[PDB]
Amino acid sequence: GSHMVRNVDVKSRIMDQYADWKGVRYRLGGSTKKGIDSSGFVQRTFREQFGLELPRSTYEQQEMGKSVSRSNLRTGDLVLFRAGSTGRHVGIYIGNNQFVHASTSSGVIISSMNEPYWKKRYNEARRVLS
């Protein structure tokens, strides 16, 4: 079998994407720097940094990969929250109890998993990178 190293500087690649996208406003169904949503930001990040094709849907991203327990989160895992009007919101865990996401209140931003709003609404996590 293959013994090539894989999955790489995951944190630095996500931070590269964040550097270029920080502050981009929230727009439902958007996919550009003029405006992007939470699942769209996850889709773009995984395409551009990891070469993986994800759907632009929190509902479908919840099905991906394998489930991870909250205690076992690793950088690059998708974090899912029962938040907002439809009860669906996704971000990318970046370690140290932080996650990056396209937020409705602030656009693309880094938030803490311990912020009371997000801590109360955390639902599940998915691992996509082996």
| HEC per residue, the chain | CCCCCCCCCHHHHHHHHHHHHCCCCECCCCEECCEECHHHHHHHHHHHHHCCCCCCCHHHHCCCCEEECHHHCCCCCEEEECCCCCCCEEEEECCCCEEEEEECCCEEEEEECCCHHHHHHEEEEEECCC
Resolution (angstroms) stands at: 1.5
CA distances 24 to 34, 67, 88, 105, Å, are: 7, 29, 20, 11
Instruction: Judge whether 129 and 5 are in contact, CB under 8 Å.
Output: no
Q: How many domains does the chain have?
A: 1
**In the chain, what is the straight-line distance between the N-terminal and C-terminal CA atoms, in Å?**
15
**Experimental method for this entry?**
X-ray
Dihedral class, residue 24 (left if φ above 0, else alpha if ψ from -120 to 50, else beta): beta
**Domain range for residue 114?**
1-130
Can you tell me which residue has the tokens 């550009």? 32
